[PDB]
Design an enzyme around this catalytic site. Structure first.
Site, short mmCIF file in Angstrom:
data_model
loop_
_atom_site.label_atom_id
_atom_site.label_comp_id
_atom_site.label_asym_id
_atom_site.label_seq_id
_atom_site.Cartn_x
_atom_site.Cartn_y
_atom_site.Cartn_z
CB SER A 61 105.20 18.91 -11.84
OG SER A 61 104.11 18.52 -12.68
CG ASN A 149 102.04 15.73 -16.57
OD1 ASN A 149 102.97 16.16 -15.89
ND2 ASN A 149 100.80 16.19 -16.46
CB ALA A 315 99.99 22.73 -9.90
CG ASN A 340 97.38 25.17 -9.10
OD1 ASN A 340 98.47 25.73 -9.09
ND2 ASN A 340 96.81 24.73 -10.23
B1 LIG Z 1 103.08 19.50 -12.87
O1 LIG Z 1 102.77 20.21 -11.63
O2 LIG Z 1 103.45 20.54 -13.85
C1 LIG Z 1 101.80 18.70 -13.31
N1 LIG Z 1 100.52 19.33 -12.96
S1 LIG Z 1 99.11 18.65 -13.31
O3 LIG Z 1 98.07 19.59 -13.11
O4 LIG Z 1 99.11 18.25 -14.70
C2 LIG Z 1 98.85 17.26 -12.33
C3 LIG Z 1 97.52 16.58 -12.47
C4 LIG Z 1 97.24 15.82 -13.61
C5 LIG Z 1 96.00 15.19 -13.70
C6 LIG Z 1 95.03 15.30 -12.70
C7 LIG Z 1 95.34 16.07 -11.59
C8 LIG Z 1 94.33 16.21 -10.46
O5 LIG Z 1 94.56 17.03 -9.54
O6 LIG Z 1 93.30 15.48 -10.43
C9 LIG Z 1 96.57 16.69 -11.48
#
Ligand SMILES: *[B]([O])([O])[C][N]S(=O)(=O)[C]C1=[C][C]=[C]C(C([O])=O)=[C]1
Length: 358
Positions: A61, A149, A315, A340
């Site tokens: 993000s 998201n 993350a 993470n």
């Molecule tokens: B942000 O960092 O707050 C979003 N983070 S997250 O974990 O939602 C990003 C994400 C979404 C869907 C799939 C994955 C993955 O690593 O396969 C990551």
């Protein structure tokens, strides 16, 4: 490098890597505007590839800050207005709950409860329309913040419609290229694969999975050098020659809503400097960061405040990133890791480093 910076960074990051069992990490400190770089450990444990200044990490993000700036640039271009109804750019979105939901709401997670994730089941474009049409808000627009998201991801997709450019095309040509971010990617090209770190989740090597609105919400990969340059650009937007981009950066750091002691920008989040470290540290924990909170509208938004702690956590399944900077002090940090690990540990280390240098 100045010994102060060496000592401050190493004394903080070394124990962090040990405590959190981080396989590989890169850090940049921007001090009086100049970057200083540090690397540890492994981009690929199995192939014994070390982290270098050219290693690509998933930003997760932190990508939202690029999306926010790209949106800002589109406003500066006169292509969109944050006050424009969402339906202006997506006419098929005819369901009545969308009345009164503006691009500002999408950009800032205040549409009224759009969910954290777009469902994995959403694979096609018609699936995406269905999802938004059928979504039922819990709250009136502009009353509660729920980090999502599906909210800023939609903003990014709509923000580039008037340009006719794909989201990736728009990002490359309007943000990455002018800022000479030449090793920053929404889709890692084959030429750069040798530099793409693996992420590690429960000991397994992983990369981010494809998903709807991934590019717009969490899909950027970058090196520690390019991220330092991203921080420099956001620290000092007036040095940017492209007028709309300079303006877009400023717009992304404007303060649109307040919740507790934090202010929501476009992608960026901001607090007044000096901060209470417990506030940003505890505040970064997903138990608070992902909670539904009432917001106070800042009417009109306050333009970017120089005496701010401006930051964003990011993350993916296998990666943990953090960026924070203080414009007034020409000071910032980027921490990129291929695990993470908990947000508060990131923010604690960042504050320890920046506080010692300020
Ligand atoms: B942000 O960092 O707050 C979003 N983070 S997250 O974990 O939602 C990003 C994400 C979404 C869907 C799939 C994955 C993955 O690593 O396969 C990551």
């Amino acid at each position: 490098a100045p010994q102060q910076i060496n000592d401050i960074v190493h004394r903080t990051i070394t124990p962090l890597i040990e405590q959190q069992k981080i396989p590989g990490m890169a850090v940049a400190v921007i001090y009086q505007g100049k970057p200083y770089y540090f690397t540890w450990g492994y981009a690929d444990i199995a192939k014994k590839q070390p982290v270098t200044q050219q290693t690509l990490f998933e930003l997760g993000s932190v990508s939202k800050t690029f999306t926010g700036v790209l949106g800002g640039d589109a406003i500066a271009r006169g292509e969109i207005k944050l006050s424009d109804p969402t339906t202006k750019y997506w006419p098929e979105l005819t369901a009545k709950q969308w009345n009164g939901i503006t691009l500002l709401h999408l950009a800032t997670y205040t549409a009224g409860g759009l969910p954290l994730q777009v469902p994995d089941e959403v694979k096609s474009s018609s699936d995406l329309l269905r999802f938004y049409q059928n979504w039922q808000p819990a709250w009136a627009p502009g009353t509660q913040r729920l980090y999502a998201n599906s909210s800023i991801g939609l903003f990014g997709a709509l923000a580039v419609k008037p340009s006719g450019l794909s989201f990736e095309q728009a990002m490359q040509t309007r943000v990455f290229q002018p800022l000479k971010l030449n090793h920053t990617w929404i889709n890692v090209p084959p030429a750069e694969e040798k530099n793409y770190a693996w992420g590690y989740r429960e000991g397994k090597a992983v990369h981010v999975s494809p998903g709807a609105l991934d590019a717009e919400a969490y899909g950027v990969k970058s090196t520690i050098e390019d991220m330092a340059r991203w921080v420099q650009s956001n620290l000092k937007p007036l040095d940017i020659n492209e007028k709309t981009l300079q303006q877009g950066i400023q717009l992304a750091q404007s303060r649109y809503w307040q919740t507790g002691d934090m202010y929501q920008g476009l992608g960026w989040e901001m607090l007044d400097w000096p901060v209470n470290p417990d506030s940003i540290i505890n505040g970064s924990d997903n138990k608070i960061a992902l909670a539904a909170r009432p917001v106070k509208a800042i009417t009109p938004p306050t333009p970017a405040v120089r005496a701010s702690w401006v930051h964003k956590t990011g993350a993916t399944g296998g990666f943990g990133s953090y960026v924070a900077f203080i414009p007034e002090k020409e000071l910032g940090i980027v921490m990129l890791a291929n695990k993470n690990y908990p947000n508060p540990a990131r923010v604690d280390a960042a504050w320890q480093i920046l506080n010692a240098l300020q």
